[PDB]
Amino acid sequence: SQSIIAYTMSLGAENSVAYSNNSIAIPTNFTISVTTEILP
Amino acid sequence: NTQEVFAQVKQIYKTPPIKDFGGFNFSQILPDPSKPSKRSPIEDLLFNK
Amino acid sequence: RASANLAATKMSECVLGQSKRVDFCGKGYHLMSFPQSAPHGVVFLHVTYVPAQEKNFTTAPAICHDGKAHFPREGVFVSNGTHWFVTQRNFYEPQIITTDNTFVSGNCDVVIGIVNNTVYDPLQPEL
Amino acid sequence: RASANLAATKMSECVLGQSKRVDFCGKGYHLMSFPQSAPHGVVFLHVT
Amino acid sequence: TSALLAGTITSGWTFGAGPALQIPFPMQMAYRFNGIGVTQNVLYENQKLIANQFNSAIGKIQDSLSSTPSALGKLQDVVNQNAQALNTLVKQLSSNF
Amino acid sequence: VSMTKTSVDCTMYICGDSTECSNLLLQYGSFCTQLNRALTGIAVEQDK
Numbered sequence: 001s002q003s004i005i006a007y008t009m010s011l012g013a014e015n016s017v018a019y020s021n022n023s024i025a026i027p028t029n030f031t032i033s034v035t036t037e038i039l040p
Numbered sequence: 041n042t043q044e045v046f047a048q049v050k051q052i053y054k055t056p057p058i059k060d061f062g063g064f065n066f067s068q069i070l071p072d073p074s075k076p077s078k079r080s081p082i083e084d085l086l087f088n089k
Numbered sequence: 090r091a092s093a094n095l096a097a098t099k100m101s102e103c104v105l106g107q108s109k110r111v112d113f114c115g116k117g118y119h120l121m122s123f124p125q126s127a128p129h130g131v132v133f134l135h136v137t138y139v140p141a142q143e144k145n146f147t148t149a150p151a152i153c154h155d156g157k158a159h160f161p162r163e164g165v166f167v168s169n170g171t172h173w174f175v176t177q178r179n180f181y182e183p184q185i186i187t188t189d190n191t192f193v194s195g196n197c198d199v200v201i202g203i204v205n206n207t208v209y210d211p212l213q214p215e216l
Numbered sequence: 217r218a219s220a221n222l223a224a225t226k227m228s229e230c231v232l233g234q235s236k237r238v239d240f241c242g243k244g245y246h247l248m249s250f251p252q253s254a255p256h257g258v259v260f261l262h263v264t
Numbered sequence: 265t266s267a268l269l270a271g272t273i274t275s276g277w278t279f280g281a282g283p284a285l286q287i288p289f290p291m292q293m294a295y296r297f298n299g300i301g302v303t304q305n306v307l308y309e310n311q312k313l314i315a316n317q318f319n320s321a322i323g324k325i326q327d328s329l330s331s332t333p334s335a336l337g338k339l340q341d342v343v344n345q346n347a348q349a350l351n352t353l354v355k356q357l358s359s360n361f
Numbered sequence: 362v363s364m365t366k367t368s369v370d371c372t373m374y375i376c377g378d379s380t381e382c383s384n385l386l387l388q389y390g391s392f393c394t395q396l397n398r399a400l401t402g403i404a405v406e407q408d409k
């Protein structure tokens with residue numbers, strides 16, 4: 001069964017992060033990615 | 041306009057427990073859990089005014 | 090005309106240099122931008138640095154040695170076990186704590202959150 | 217639209233990083249900026 | 265706005281680029297003093313003074329934004345001129361031409 | 362950065378020395394009232 005549906009907004013995924021006060025995260029590895037910006 | 045000014049990042053982040061932010065007191069700007077709205081105290085003053 | 094002035098600003102600060110402006114020239118830390126022509130427009134190739142594969146470590150604001158606080162000249166004081174290391178903020182390159190990359194100012198009692206460890210010197214073992 | 221693009225630039229580099237641009241993100245040396253909502257607008261807290 | 269504030273005060277500025285690396289806050293602020301040419305030791309030496317100054321500045325900006333005459337006229341002018349445009353249109357429709 | 366301030370009088374533009382200035386006014390002067398509001402806004406904008 002396929003039909004038109006109405007849903008509330010998906011504001012985003014819930015990201016769980018812990019501030020603490022004696023913990024740091026540092027990126028071990030990195031990625032390079034090119035993105036296209038189109039301007040008339 | 042409001043989409044590109046307000047949703048530059050589309051990753052929602054929960055409010056951390058307000059404890060030991062180095063003495064920096066983020067009660068005014070962060071939304072208090074006293075009300076079910078996600079509005080802060082100065083945000084409420086701006087919306088009322 | 091507003092979009093054309095925006096594109097000439099991006100042609101000037103993304104292609105002809107490197108922009109420290111976040112999100113102006115790419116989703117991430119900007120590295121380059123390659124212009125490409127288009128019908129009544131310009132398409133940009135915004136190459137950016139994007140880090141990943143993060144790790145969580147325990148840090149301290151400074152190091153106490155011989156009654157003096159030692160501060161990172163660059164990077165962050167990091168730890169996993171017992172050994173304390175200094176590394177730059179954007180990439181994990183663990184370096185042993187030495188006076189060449191550590192800056193000293195004041196004593197160790199004025200600052201909160203200090204941990205104590207051996208700060209190595211490069212000069213005494215040769216001498 | 218012009219004011220909205222200005223505000224999204226200030227969301228883009230006054231809130232999401234640190235600005236070396238003088239007076240653009242606050243009077244003095246900018247540290248951070250805390251965004252705050254408003255009726256049909258955005259109110260900034262440019263701490264410097 | 266709450267998500268932006270949580271990313272700002274918990275991750276620092278790495279949430280814009282990459283995947284929101286956490287950072288103790290006194291250390292993000294020292295790292296943001298490092299961007300204005302002052303060394304981080306000044307902050308770590310005067311953390312209580314900086315925290316008290318920031319708390320007082322937030323209190324002062326709340327008292328200023330709670331006096332009624334707030335510099336909120338630029339936001340009020342948009343709604344006022346839109347309502348003026350609409351009511352001018354219906355008073356125009358009142359005319360006989 | 363600035364442009365010369367300008368303003369228009371409704372009577373001296375469209376009325377002039379017309380005897381039925383009232384007949385021109387009650388039917389068509391609200392347009393010029395809007396136009397004077399726009400011109401006053403432009404002058405204030407150039408000062409700011």
Ligand SMILES: *[C@@H]1O[C@H](CO)[C@@H](O[C@@H]2O[C@H](CO)[C@@H](O)[C@H](O)[C@H]2NC(C)=O)[C@H](O)[C@H]1NC(C)=O
Pocket residue numbers: 169170171172183
């Ligand atoms: C944290 O990472 C360092 C990076 O090498 C590890 O250092 C080792 O420490 C042990 C002592 O416990 C030495 O015997 C080794 O020679 C060191 N190097 C290596 C490559 O093993 C350290 O073990 C790590 N700590 C934890 C808890 O994982």
Ligand SMILES: *[C@@H]1O[C@H](CO)[C@@H](O)[C@H](O)[C@H]1NC(C)=O
Pocket residue numbers: 029030031
């Ligand atoms: C880092 O780069 C890519 C991950 O995108 C992977 O192929 C490579 O092996 C990684 N290197 C290390 C040391 O993790």
Ligand SMILES: *[C@@H]1O[C@H](CO)[C@@H](O)[C@H](O)[C@H]1NC(C)=O
Pocket residue numbers: 058059060065066067
């Ligand atoms: C933050 O500020 C509020 C209001 O001034 C205060 O009640 C609260 O105790 C402060 N936070 C801490 C951890 O003291």
Ligand SMILES: *[C@@H]1O[C@H](CO)[C@@H](O)[C@H](O)[C@H]1NC(C)=O
Pocket residue numbers: 020021022060201202203
């Ligand atoms: C972090 O908070 C804990 C309390 O949970 C405290 O014991 C510790 O001293 C704090 N460390 C710093 C660096 O503020």
Ligand SMILES: *[C@@H]1O[C@H](CO)[C@@H](O)[C@H](O)[C@H]1NC(C)=O
Pocket residue numbers: 153197203204205
């Ligand atoms: C290291 O710093 C701590 C601060 O908690 C202090 O108690 C300790 O005495 C210091 N180390 C030495 C060897 O004095």
